[PDB]
Amino acid sequence: TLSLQLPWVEKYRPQVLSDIVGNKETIDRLQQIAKDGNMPHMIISGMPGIGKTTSVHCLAHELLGRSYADGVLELNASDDRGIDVVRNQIKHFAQKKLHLPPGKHKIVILDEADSMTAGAQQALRRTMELYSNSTRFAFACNQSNKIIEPLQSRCAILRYSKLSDEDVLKRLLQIIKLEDVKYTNDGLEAIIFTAEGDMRQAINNLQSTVAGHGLVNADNVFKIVDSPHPLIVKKMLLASNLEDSIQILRTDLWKKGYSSIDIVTTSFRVTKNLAQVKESVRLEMIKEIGLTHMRILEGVGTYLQLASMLAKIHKLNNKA
Amino acid sequence: REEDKLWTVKYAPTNLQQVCGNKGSVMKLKNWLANWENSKKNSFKHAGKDGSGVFRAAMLYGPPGIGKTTAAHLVAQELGYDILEQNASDVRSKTLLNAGVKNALDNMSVVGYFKHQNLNGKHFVIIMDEVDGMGGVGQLAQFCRKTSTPLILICNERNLPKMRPFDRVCLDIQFRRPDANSIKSRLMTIAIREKFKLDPNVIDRLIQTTRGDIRQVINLLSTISTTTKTINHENINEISKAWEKNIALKPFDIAHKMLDGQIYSDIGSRNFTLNDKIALYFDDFDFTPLMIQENYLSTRPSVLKPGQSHLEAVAEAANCISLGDIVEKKIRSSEQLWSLLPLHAVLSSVYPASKVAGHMAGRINFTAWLGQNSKSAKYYRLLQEIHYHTR
Amino acid sequence: MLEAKFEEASLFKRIIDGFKDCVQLVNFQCKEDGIIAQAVDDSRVLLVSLEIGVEAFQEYRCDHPVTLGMDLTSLSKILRCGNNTDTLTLIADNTPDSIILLFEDTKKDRIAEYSLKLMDIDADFLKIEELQYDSTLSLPSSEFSKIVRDLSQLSDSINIMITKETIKFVADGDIGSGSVIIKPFVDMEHPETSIKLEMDQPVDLTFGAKYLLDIIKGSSLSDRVGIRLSSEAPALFQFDLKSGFLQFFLAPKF
Amino acid sequence: ASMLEAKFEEASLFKRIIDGFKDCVQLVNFQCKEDGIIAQAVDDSRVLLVSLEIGVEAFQEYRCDHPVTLGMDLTSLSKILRCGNNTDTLTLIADNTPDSIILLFEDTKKDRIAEYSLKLMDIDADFLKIEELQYDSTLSLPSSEFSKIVRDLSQLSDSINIMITKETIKFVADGDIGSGSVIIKPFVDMEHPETSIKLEMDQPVDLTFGAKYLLDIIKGSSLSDRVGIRLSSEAPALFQFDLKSGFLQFFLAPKFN
Amino acid sequence: MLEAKFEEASLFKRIIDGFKDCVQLVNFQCKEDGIIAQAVDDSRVLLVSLEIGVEAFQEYRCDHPVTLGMDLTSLSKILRCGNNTDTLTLIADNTPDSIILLFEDTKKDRIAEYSLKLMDIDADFLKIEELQYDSTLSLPSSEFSKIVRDLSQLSDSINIMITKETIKFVADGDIGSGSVIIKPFVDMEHPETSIKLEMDQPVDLTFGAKYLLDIIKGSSLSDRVGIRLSSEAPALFQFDLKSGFLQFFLAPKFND
DNA sequence: GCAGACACTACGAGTACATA
DNA sequence: TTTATGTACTCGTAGTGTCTGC
Numbered sequence A: 001t002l003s004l005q006l007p008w009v010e011k012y013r014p015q016v017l018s019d020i021v022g023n024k025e026t027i028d029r030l031q032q033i034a035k036d037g038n039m040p041h042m043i044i045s046g047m048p049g050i051g052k053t054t055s056v057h058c059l060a061h062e063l064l065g066r067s068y069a070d071g072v073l074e075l076n077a078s079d080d081r082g083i084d085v086v087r088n089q090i091k092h093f094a095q096k097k098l099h100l101p102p103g104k105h106k107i108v109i110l111d112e113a114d115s116m117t118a119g120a121q122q123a124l125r126r127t128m129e130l131y132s133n134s135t136r137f138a139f140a141c142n143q144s145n146k147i148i149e150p151l152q153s154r155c156a157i158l159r160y161s162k163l164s165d166e167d168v169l170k171r172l173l174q175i176i177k178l179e180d181v182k183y184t185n186d187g188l189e190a191i192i193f194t195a196e197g198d199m200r201q202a203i204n205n206l207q208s209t210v211a212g213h214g215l216v217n218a219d220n221v222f223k224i225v226d227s228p229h230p231l232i233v234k235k236m237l238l239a240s241n242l243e244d245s246i247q248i249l250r251t252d253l254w255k256k257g258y259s260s261i262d263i264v265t266t267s268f269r270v271t272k273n274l275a276q277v278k279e280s281v282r283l284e285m286i287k288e289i290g291l292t293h294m295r296i297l298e299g300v301g302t303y304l305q306l307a308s309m310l311a312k313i314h315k316l317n318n319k320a
Numbered sequence B: 001r002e003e004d005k006l007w008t009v010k011y012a013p014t015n016l017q018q019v020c021g022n023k024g025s026v027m028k029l030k031n032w033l034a035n036w037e038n039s040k041k042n043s044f045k046h047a048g049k050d051g052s053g054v055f056r057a058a059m060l061y062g063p064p065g066i067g068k069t070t071a072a073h074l075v076a077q078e079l080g081y082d083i084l085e086q087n088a089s090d091v092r093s094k095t096l097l098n099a100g101v102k103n104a105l106d107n108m109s110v111v112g113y114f115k116h117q118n119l120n121g122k123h124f125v126i127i128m129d130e131v132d133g134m135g136g137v138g139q140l141a142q143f144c145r146k147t148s149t150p151l152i153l154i155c156n157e158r159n160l161p162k163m164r165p166f167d168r169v170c171l172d173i174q175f176r177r178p179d180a181n182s183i184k185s186r187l188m189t190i191a192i193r194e195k196f197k198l199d200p201n202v203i204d205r206l207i208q209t210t211r212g213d214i215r216q217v218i219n220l221l222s223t224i225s226t227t228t229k230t231i232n233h234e235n236i237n238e239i240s241k242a243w244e245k246n247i248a249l250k251p252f253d254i255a256h257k258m259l260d261g262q263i264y265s266d267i268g269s270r271n272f273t274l275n276d277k278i279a280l281y282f283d284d285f286d287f288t289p290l291m292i293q294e295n296y297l298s299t300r301p302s303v304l305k306p307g308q309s310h311l312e313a314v315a316e317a318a319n320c321i322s323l324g325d326i327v328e329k330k331i332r333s334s335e336q337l338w339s340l341l342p343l344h345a346v347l348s349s350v351y352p353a354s355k356v357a358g359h360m361a362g363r364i365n366f367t368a369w370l371g372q373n374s375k376s377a378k379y380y381r382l383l384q385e386i387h388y389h390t391r
Numbered sequence C: 001m002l003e004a005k006f007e008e009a010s011l012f013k014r015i016i017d018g019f020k021d022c023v024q025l026v027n028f029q030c031k032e033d034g035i036i037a038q039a040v041d042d043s044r045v046l047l048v049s050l051e052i053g054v055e056a057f058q059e060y061r062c063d064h065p066v067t068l069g070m071d072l073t074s075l076s077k078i079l080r081c082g083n084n085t086d087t088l089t090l091i092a093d094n095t096p097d098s099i100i101l102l103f104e105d106t107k108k109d110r111i112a113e114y115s116l117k118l119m120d121i122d123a124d125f126l127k128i129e130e131l132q133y134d135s136t137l138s139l140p141s142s143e144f145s146k147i148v149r150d151l152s153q154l155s156d157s158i159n160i161m162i163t164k165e166t167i168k169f170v171a172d173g174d175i176g177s178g179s180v181i182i183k184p185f186v187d188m189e190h191p192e193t194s195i196k197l198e199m200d201q202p203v204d205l206t207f208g209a210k211y212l213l214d215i216i217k218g219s220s221l222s223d224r225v226g227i228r229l230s231s232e233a234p235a236l237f238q239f240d241l242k243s244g245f246l247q248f249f250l251a252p253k254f
Numbered sequence D: 001a002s003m004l005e006a007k008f009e010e011a012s013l014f015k016r017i018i019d020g021f022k023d024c025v026q027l028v029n030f031q032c033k034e035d036g037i038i039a040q041a042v043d044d045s046r047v048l049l050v051s052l053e054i055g056v057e058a059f060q061e062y063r064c065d066h067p068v069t070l071g072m073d074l075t076s077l078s079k080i081l082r083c084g085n086n087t088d089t090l091t092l093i094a095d096n097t098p099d100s101i102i103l104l105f106e107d108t109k110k111d112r113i114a115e116y117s118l119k120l121m122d123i124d125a126d127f128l129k130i131e132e133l134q135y136d137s138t139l140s141l142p143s144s145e146f147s148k149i150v151r152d153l154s155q156l157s158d159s160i161n162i163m164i165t166k167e168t169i170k171f172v173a174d175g176d177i178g179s180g181s182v183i184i185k186p187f188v189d190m191e192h193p194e195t196s197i198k199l200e201m202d203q204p205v206d207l208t209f210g211a212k213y214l215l216d217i218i219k220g221s222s223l224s225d226r227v228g229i230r231l232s233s234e235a236p237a238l239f240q241f242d243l244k245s246g247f248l249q250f251f252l253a254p255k256f257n
Numbered sequence E: 001m002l003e004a005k006f007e008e009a010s011l012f013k014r015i016i017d018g019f020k021d022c023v024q025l026v027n028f029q030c031k032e033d034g035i036i037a038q039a040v041d042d043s044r045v046l047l048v049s050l051e052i053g054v055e056a057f058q059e060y061r062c063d064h065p066v067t068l069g070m071d072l073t074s075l076s077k078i079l080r081c082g083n084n085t086d087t088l089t090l091i092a093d094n095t096p097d098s099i100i101l102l103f104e105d106t107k108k109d110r111i112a113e114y115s116l117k118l119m120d121i122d123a124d125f126l127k128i129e130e131l132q133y134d135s136t137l138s139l140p141s142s143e144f145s146k147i148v149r150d151l152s153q154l155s156d157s158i159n160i161m162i163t164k165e166t167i168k169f170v171a172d173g174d175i176g177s178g179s180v181i182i183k184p185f186v187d188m189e190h191p192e193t194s195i196k197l198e199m200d201q202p203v204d205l206t207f208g209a210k211y212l213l214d215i216i217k218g219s220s221l222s223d224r225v226g227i228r229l230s231s232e233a234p235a236l237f238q239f240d241l242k243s244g245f246l247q248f249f250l251a252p253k254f255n256d
Numbered sequence F: 001g002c003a004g005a006c007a008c009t010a011c012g013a014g015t016a017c018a019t020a
Numbered sequence G: 001t002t003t004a005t006g007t008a009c010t011c012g013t014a015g016t017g018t019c020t021g022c
């Protein structure tokens, strides 16, 4: 068993703030914090895979250098971050006396901060308020709703947005030029379409296509990784002909190996996130999709139930 | 030092004349703590001019970042009272609270002995900041009944049932959202002191979007001044949208926002999509289904379809409320299907309120099904008692 | 630059055991004359002042005055890890971010070197006073500990009376009465059993028992303890260590 | 009468042997043979491997003609050993490929007789031929000293790093409270031969281990007066506790990086 | 009218310790011959009988027959003051709605008096149908508790197969099987450990687990416990006492 | 060595969340 | 505030064990 090569997701992880693409204003603000040194408490939020925790790690590396071994305390969901056994850890770390450069402070990376309990954040409130001169915190959560409002009242809100296609394409081309793999622009746009602004997904699909076919042409890309089924569901629900919707359902989901419950949940999510049709029509569509969802969850999962769901969706859509 | 300290720390108020807004509440606190000893000499058998003679304890609540902690600290320090604070970072368990400041309820300040005329620099003022971070509340209430030192508490939400015992054991002082003029002046001073330009019309929108959170306003100013020192009316909407605070909403306000007729209008749905309605329901998923049902029939409807009367809309909303009941029963059963919550959200709050939306006929009433159900459960128990006794 | 060599890691463990129950953060201020520790309880009601003479150390080398603010729990844990018989050696580098306290064993050879991370104690310094105390009574430590543990089962209020030139202890209160009067115990045969009292004015001071246990827990270090009472200034519970002194300041209850 | 008979001199020996590695292992696979009884068992995390072996000299009488695979459960085994007087003479009894074994808790030497039986457990995992290899180092220190060092260092960090270089044993554990650096110089004493820090040297080793697993190792220090540790950069750590007639190894897997 | 003065405070407490888990409450019936308090469990399966003599437990003065029904939790809470020297005093006046439990100590002058509430039960059935038992067994109670807890930990069902010269205890469970056999062995030097099984007819009855645990909980009542088995009849677990005895009954559930 | 003291692991009752 | 399992967290308690001591 030979030692595995490090995956391109981790091999080409950025180590400096310049390499992170997307959200130019946020990255420039982070760079100005980096050279300025006056890091405030911040909470970083966004959709997964767009570069949240890597910016935190890069900023922690840049602000303080050889002190990175002991000047930063990183915590995560794998560590049992509770109210009692962990309040002492941050209390000691903030109370720990370590000599920094004049404009640098200790960093407490509470990575994946949306999973902590309420009491832990309640203690962290005064923990942050007391030793603000010595230590600074860095929350990195997918969802900022779990963080209580006292924590939001003393933090710098840094909202990341989903990456534009141009930035993903730019960093992808950088990766190709460092790896020297033959590429076609159609294949690259296929990767961009499949990723949906999720960068790690783009890198993983690039890995699979490169190591599966050598060439990243569009046919090989669509052979290896399938198109995202939310788009297929949205296409199916928006069709005007019932026969067309049924054919799309069967061919693209039932013959491709998709569970009925997955189709129902994706249809519910697409309907609630859809905006072209009238609001009320979306309300009855959601009600019918939920009725079919109850039928599926109660035990009867069949192509017939999905076909009936589509038939009634067309009944509401075509206005009787 | 400078340039290495947080902006919300170096610009903290130094006296009671540097607090933005809440002049009445700070004045009330100063009067109460400046007359506690007279009440002690009076043995707490009558009130004073403002009523401070009956309450040996006070409590402060309000929105975060408005100045409760700063007001408490400045009031304690100005009269020389030695601060003795307990916080959520330390344990407030019953045994440790009895093993903590219980002896300090009538002792003296040894550091007050050593520090120092400071006539009243020789006593403890006790500070439970962040009371909501909790039998701790019972021990704190029993402390409030019997204390030989000045005592105040700082929390955020009195309406929570866990501070219900604090109903009439403390002198309540309520802090509100400060008026924008004082914050405007403070930010003018800060901007002219920290070399970055600030535009007067921008402070109003910053306070409006930040929802009266002065500390977060200072943090916003610092973060913007890190790279773009100039603040104008061009990027005001960009900054407001980027730093908008998604605060949770109270059940009565949830019912009010759900029953507002604008969100279901064609124009009003571009920004407040139904996904936002689901997210608004999910804040309090245990009270919203009960709140919608008890006041969806006491409004003027403003979204009536042509040829449809108010009664028809009421019936069509009641049908989906009944459907949501069945959905909830499947959710909270042995099967325990909690993936069905988004469906229950629609069927119990969104659709029934999408037909009777409009201004209130009266006003939003608290849910009565809880009290009626409790009384019915007790009546069932008493019925079973007499059924078994006579059998 | 700090090199504090102990003849054995016994008296240091004993003093840390003695005052670790009440105070939780101390601040060792090391100077040429030796080491000075200033301690304030978390309730800010009792103050522990400790200084150790240079002759207690087997060898003490210092260059610059450096402070060391520690944590009692971690320090006590690290000290208990090491063997009692070993010879402690406190070492602090140019940067006082961490101390290097190491245990040396004469038998065998086991250098169980340990490192402890310092803490940033607040800017409050020592403001030691010299105000006159009316009462200075100095009695055996063991029997004082015995009698105050006997009286501790009563109410928390422990008031000391200086009436009639005789040491009069009272432990009365709400739950019961604990008034027990003791007599001077001066003896010519045993110098370790001697009691002297100034008796300037019968002043009345009351204290708390749950802390007084923490004061009397340090009775192991010195067989002779002296309560120095003042009309206004806080009480003093001084223990005359072999080289320095270890004294407790207790704020009078009221 | 029964094919497999193993009458212990005392139930205390088997109780101590079982309690030595009861905590760190859930499923045990005994393999009785004529040469003796062995037990190769793997932890749930598949990091710590226990290889019990009891020679024929630790049994007052022993006889097992056919090889028997006794896959068992230590929780119920210890529960069975929990009941029964410790002075009693245990006699392990099993049939030809049985569904259970019989625990003869013969009280004293007469009168009361117990017949506790534990249903045999189907463990199809074959024994792992991890015996030994060319180990870089071979040290030998008293069990009490090693247990004390591990117990002291576990309170300071979650990882204990064992380093051997130029006839010197060094334990370091850097953590949050502090960083222990307990060091041992090898020596030998004729006056007290039990305490002797033996050592061998081929190449220096710097291997780190978890704290909880090392505590699990030192829980078994009551069985043996001496413990022998052998380390290598390309081998799991070996902790050979010497018994009255056999041994009890502990193949611990070091962390990487 | 009732003056049931008890010699030791931590003796009636020792009895109610056994009484606590066997049944939730008992209906006391005090007579000058002795104190009897029998109660029926919630399952109507386990029967508890109480008998207290008059020669010991200080002087007993039952002027009138008094029937009282009360709980044991509050009784234990009052009897928590169970010092080795303290005594007991039972006083029941006309309409004894609240019994005053006087504590007087010989070693110290401290006194303690408490009142116990009385609930309205007025229900007590006393019937002892069977006295003849095929097998009568006496053995130390601590060993009985040990063997019962060891067998009940392994299995939830306990059966006994009494044969010639063997008092066989067998417990079959999913985890395994425990078949402990004890022989009748009497040492004149150690009366407590003496074991005799009188033999008239072999008895094979299958019992439960929680009932056996409740029976063995009161192991400290007697050094030697009298175990009586009768075929096709309820069992009798008689615990001896200095004045009287306490017997426990159980139905031998059997579905084969 | 028996007794107390000590801090440890183990256990049980209570609360709060459950879709983005 | 009812909901009605399963999960996770937290605290408190009861013993159980080895460690100091006379």
Ligand SMILES: Nc1ncnc2c1ncn2[C@@H]1O[C@H](COP(=O)(O)OP(=O)(O)OP(O)(O)=S)[C@@H](O)[C@H]1O
Pocket (backbone or CB within 6 Å): A008, A009, A010, A012, A013, A014, A019, A020, A021, A022, A047, A048, A049, A050, A051, A052, A053, A054, A055, A141, A142, A171, A199, A200, A203
């Ligand atoms: N803007 C970016 N520029 C370059 N690489 C990026 C960028 N965003 C993400 N990546 C890559 O994404 C991988 C790791 O992304 P992460 O930042 O760890 O994901 P994330 O933002 O933390 O989302 P979650 O919530 O943790 S799943 C690495 O391979 C990075 O190179």
Ligand SMILES: Nc1ncnc2c1ncn2[C@@H]1O[C@H](COP(=O)(O)OP(=O)(O)OP(O)(O)=S)[C@@H](O)[C@H]1O
Pocket (backbone or CB within 6 Å): A150, A153, B007, B008, B009, B011, B012, B013, B018, B019, B020, B021, B063, B064, B065, B066, B067, B068, B069, B070, B071, B156, B178, B186, B214, B215, B218
């Ligand atoms: N009225 C005010 N005027 C000026 N600065 C203020 C005012 N209120 C708050 N601040 C600033 O906000 C900082 C912190 O305010 P705090 O009083 O600690 O907030 P808070 O009232 O405690 O709310 P919590 O505790 O987070 S819920 C102060 O140090 C000031 O810099």
Ligand SMILES: [Mg+2]
Pocket (backbone or CB within 6 Å): A052, A053, A054
């Ligand atoms: Mg991440």
Ligand SMILES: [Mg+2]
Pocket (backbone or CB within 6 Å): B068, B069, B129, B130, B154
């Ligand atoms: Mg506050």
